[PDB]
Symmetry: C6
């Protein structure tokens, strides 16, 4: 039990806005989180998003 380990895993199943490093914004639902990836649904599309490409997430 390490409380301050990874906050991103708590986003699984949630509606979020993902702000990517190039300025793109994803209105997403999170469908999975790994150490390095966040899986999302955006509209009809399924995306694997690398965390290194994310600047911040609004939730």
């Amino acid at each position: 039990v390490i409380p301050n380990f990874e906050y991103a895993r708590r986003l699984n199943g949630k509606k979020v806005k993902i702000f990517l490093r190039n300025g793109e914004v994803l209105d997403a639902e999170v469908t999975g989180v790994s150490n390095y990836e966040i899986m999302v649904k955006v509209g009809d599309r399924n995306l694997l998003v690398f965390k290194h490409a994310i600047d911040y997430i609004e939730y």
Copy 2:
């Protein structure tokens, strides 16, 4: 197991992002890779890799 960023928990700071934005933020949590903040009525998860520096 030491990070200076942990010293900023609960504090008002200015986060200078790699995208050029400056967040007027209250820090609500610090993990190894993330900083959780309140900016106005918004809750953000900020990745440390996207931060250039923090003024405190």
Copy 3:
């Protein structure tokens, strides 16, 4: 340990790179740091650090 990218092996995907390029790519291999693809007749080694996201 676990990664979702390995499950894309054998799929045809759209890889959106950090430079704004998109690759219409058949995935032929995945390692911790790399994704091997065929794009048309070209064979590429793509570094995961250069990928923003993948549509599958």
Copy 4:
């Protein structure tokens, strides 16, 4: 050996920090961790992430 770094040898020194965003910090170094450099810049206190630094002149 493990965790040797030159950056902590700049601890307590006046330096110029050239950031990836084009900014140059005229800085006094007050602490160095594995991933961060703490600095005073004039009357400002900054936590600078090493990943945002291109090079440091000392």
Copy 5:
């Protein structure tokens, strides 16, 4: 894990698409965890993998 496909490029002549838009026509002479050593014409370069977007071979 901790397999690298890049090691198999040793001895090949490849196109390295760098993160800034430059492209190197490069003979690979060595590969480490973080670096690719190349010959580009008469020039010897150490290329950091973090600066590479992709490699065509």
Copy 6:
């Protein structure tokens, strides 16, 4: 886990930085994450993450 950059210690090199700058340098030290150089009269600590490639 080997690194080629260590063998640049003491050598004249040209360092091509991610910002488009080029350093005509002599290497004075190499660590896991840093390369120390002299450029003319200036002493610099260069982070490897900021380097694209090195001509030597």
